[PDB]
Amino acid sequence: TGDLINTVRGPIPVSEAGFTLTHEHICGSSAGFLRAWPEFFGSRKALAEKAVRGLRHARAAGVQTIVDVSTFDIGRDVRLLAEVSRAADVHIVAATGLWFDPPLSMRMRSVEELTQFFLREIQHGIEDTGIRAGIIKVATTGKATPFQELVLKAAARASLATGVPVTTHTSASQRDGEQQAAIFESEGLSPSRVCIGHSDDTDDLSYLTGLAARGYLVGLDRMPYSAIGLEGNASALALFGTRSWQTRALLIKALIDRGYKDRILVSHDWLFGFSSYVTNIMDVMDRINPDGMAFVPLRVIPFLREKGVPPETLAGVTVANPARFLSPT
Amino acid sequence: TGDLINTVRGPIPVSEAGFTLTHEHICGSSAGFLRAWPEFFGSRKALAEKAVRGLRHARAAGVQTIVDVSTFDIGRDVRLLAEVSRAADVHIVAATGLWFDPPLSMRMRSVEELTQFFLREIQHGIEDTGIRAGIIKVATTGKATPFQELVLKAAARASLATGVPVTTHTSASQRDGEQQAAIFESEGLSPSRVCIGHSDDTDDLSYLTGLAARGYLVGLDRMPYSAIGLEGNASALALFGTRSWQTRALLIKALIDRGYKDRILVSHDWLFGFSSYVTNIMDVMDRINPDGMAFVPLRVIPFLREKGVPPETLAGVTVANPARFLSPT
Numbered sequence: 157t158g159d160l161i162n163t164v165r166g167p168i169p170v171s172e173a174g175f176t177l178t179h180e181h182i183c184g185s186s187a188g189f190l191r192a193w194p195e196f197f198g199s200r201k202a203l204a205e206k207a208v209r210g211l212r213h214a215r216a217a218g219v220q221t222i223v224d225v226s227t228f229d230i231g232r233d234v235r236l237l238a239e240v241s242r243a244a245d246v247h248i249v250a251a252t253g254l255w256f257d258p259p260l261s262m263r264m265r266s267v268e269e270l271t272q273f274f275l276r277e278i279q280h281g282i283e284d285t286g287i288r289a290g291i292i293k294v295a296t297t298g299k300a301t302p303f304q305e306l307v308l309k310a311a312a313r314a315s316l317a318t319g320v321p322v323t324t325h326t327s328a329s330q331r332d333g334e335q336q337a338a339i340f341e342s343e344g345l346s347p348s349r350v351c352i353g354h355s356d357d358t359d360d361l362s363y364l365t366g367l368a369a370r371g372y373l374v375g376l377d378r379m380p381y382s383a384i385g386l387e388g389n390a391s392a393l394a395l396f397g398t399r400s401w402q403t404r405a406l407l408i409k410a411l412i413d414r415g416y417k418d419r420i421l422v423s424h425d426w427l428f429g430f431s432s433y434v435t436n437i438m439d440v441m442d443r444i445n446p447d448g449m450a451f452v453p454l455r456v457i458p459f460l461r462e463k464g465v466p467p468e469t470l471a472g473v474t475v476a477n478p479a480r481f482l483s484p485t
Numbered sequence: 486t487g488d489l490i491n492t493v494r495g496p497i498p499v500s501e502a503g504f505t506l507t508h509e510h511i512c513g514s515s516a517g518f519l520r521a522w523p524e525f526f527g528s529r530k531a532l533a534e535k536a537v538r539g540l541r542h543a544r545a546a547g548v549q550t551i552v553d554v555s556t557f558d559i560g561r562d563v564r565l566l567a568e569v570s571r572a573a574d575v576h577i578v579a580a581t582g583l584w585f586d587p588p589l590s591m592r593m594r595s596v597e598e599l600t601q602f603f604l605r606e607i608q609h610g611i612e613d614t615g616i617r618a619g620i621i622k623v624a625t626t627g628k629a630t631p632f633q634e635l636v637l638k639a640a641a642r643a644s645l646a647t648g649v650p651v652t653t654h655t656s657a658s659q660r661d662g663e664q665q666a667a668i669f670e671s672e673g674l675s676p677s678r679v680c681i682g683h684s685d686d687t688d689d690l691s692y693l694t695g696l697a698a699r700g701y702l703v704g705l706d707r708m709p710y711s712a713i714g715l716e717g718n719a720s721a722l723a724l725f726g727t728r729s730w731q732t733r734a735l736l737i738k739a740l741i742d743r744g745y746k747d748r749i750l751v752s753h754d755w756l757f758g759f760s761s762y763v764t765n766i767m768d769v770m771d772r773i774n775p776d777g778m779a780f781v782p783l784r785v786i787p788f789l790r791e792k793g794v795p796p797e798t799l800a801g802v803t804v805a806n807p808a809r810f811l812s813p814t
């Protein structure tokens with residue numbers, strides 16, 4: 157009791173977060189896009205309605221909180237998040253940071269300037285809303301670009317000043333987490349403040365246990381993603397991969413079996429609208445996973461239970477781990 | 486009489502446009518940036534105040550209208566434009582199109598989809614404001630990227646449907662205008678609907694007269710840009726170049742002397758805030774050209790008069806040419 161986390165509806169006690177999905181999106185887009193071209197999504201109204209239906213379905217399955225890791229350059233619309241959170245009665249934690257599509261006005265900035273931006277979104281509020289970010293999202297796609305090095309350093313500095321955790325996008329097959337770790341540690345950031353994400357995109361347990369041993373949280377966060385049976389769709393293949401959800405879920409058990417139950421975070425990386433990829437990708441996704449953000453509780457958790465993972469362990473992964481991660485520390 | 490152009494304050498008669506600067510910016514930024522980080526500019530209030538002071542200075546020097554060619558990805562804020570236009574009593578024509586920093590949500594789009602976006606901003610309104618674009622801005626930096634080819638085609642299609650003109654950013658030293666012309670003509674766009682911009686960044690009159698002969702408008706639109714005396718500043722050198730404003734202004738006379746007075750558009754490419762380049766670039770610019778958008782009437786026009794260009798010719802360049810260009814045709 158006592159510790160608090162910021163959500164799009166204001167502060168909540170850490171203990172009320174409950175079953176928490178730590179890497180999710182209401183909408184995957186671009187800065188200013190929803191404001192300029194809402195018809196891309198049918199309408200803003202239709203997008204909101206779809207998101208509310210989706211979050212209510214997750215809620216029914218026992219999800220109490222999601223962390224929307226959409227940054228500025230993912231086109232995060234905090235007003236939209238607040239609206240859908242209110243209508244579905246599911247907590248949403250918003251993010252600061254930068255993903256891999258920053259515009260020039262961000263790309264030209266120094267580490268000091270980026271630190272000031274991230275601190276603004278955490279301490280003051282996002283835009284003119286007063287809604288405060290509760291996590292910092294960063295990204296590499298292979299070896300960090302020079303700018304990405306600055307972003308990771310600024311994220312470490314903002315985290316040290318505020319206690320808010322850092323979470324990452326990686327190219328997992330390229331083992332980006334090792335370089336990300338080195339950068340964070342060079343700034344004196346504690347590994348317990350960091351989740352190395354998309355770590356279920358690889359079956360390389362040497363890579364994953366190496367990180368877990370050092371105290372990093374390992375994000376197994378793309379559970380429903382698979383293009384099995386859609387191999388003729390090049391764009392779906394490239395984004396989803398050729399590994400089954402069962403293959404992804406097996407990594408949760410693998411890390412538990414190797415003593416790392418306290419180092420695992422589980423999610424879908426789902427969304428309800430998606431403009432930063434090919435047209436109609438959302439329709440393809442909705443066909444692969446009609447359950448959306450209820451997929452983890454409905455399919456993954458029972459799968460693990462049937463493999464013999466104890467209820468206490470599953471509760472520790474889906475409740476205790478997100479709570480420790482999100483609590484400002 | 487009769488013909489109309491759309492401005493940020495609504496429709497105006499073409500004949501009231503008067504002395505018009507055809508390539509300008511209130512603020513050079515990025516989509517969503519002003520909303521997310523207004524403190525970059527001191528504040529939104531300070532930016533607006535500076536812009537109002539600047540436009541009032543231009544107005545005093547005889548400027549009646551500017552065309553703000555900031556696109557979505559230049560971080561065009563049409564509400565800001567409306568506010569400053571009202572306060573300074575200077576007409577501002579807003580733009581649609583895409584410059585060279587489009588985010589993924591734009592880069593993934595087809596020619597048909599881009600055409601729909603440009604038509605939305607021209608026919609329906611920008612964002613939720615009802616303010617209609619009166620020009621389409623496009624850009625290459627050397628040979629067009631595959632996406633840039635789509636953008637130029639969509640611009641041609643939107644222009645053919647609405648009569649609104651198209652204006653371009655080029656790498657002038659790379660003679661981009663020739664490829665841009667070929668793309669536009671392949672879509673059946675009339676050259677009289679097109680301005681090939683930043684054409685004063687080169688002294689190549691073979692290139693420029695080639696375009697003018699075909700009926701293109703030639704944009705001599707960076708008049709005050711020079712890093713002479715600032716050669717120790719690498720970023721200023723790269724952006725401003727090493728040619729004097731007099732050297733740029735001489736090209737106006739050159740084209741007049743070769744029979745092309747009706748094919749010339751003159752401007753500054755100035756701005757009052759600038760986040761898409763190095764920090765404090767605005768301070769450097771304000772030192773080089775304290776007159777801002779009054780520089781053309783105060784310095785360039787008298788320079789040309791003193792070289793013997795008749796008043797009637799100068800009036801044709803600064804009034805008649807913009808009127809014919811902007812009138813939907």
Ligand SMILES: [Co+2]
Nearest residue numbers: 325326354425
């Ligand atoms: Co990602």
Ligand SMILES: [Co+2]
Nearest residue numbers: 180181225425
């Ligand atoms: Co994601």
Ligand SMILES: [Co+2]
Nearest residue numbers: 654655683754
């Ligand atoms: Co330009």
Ligand SMILES: [Co+2]
Nearest residue numbers: 509510554754
């Ligand atoms: Co410009």
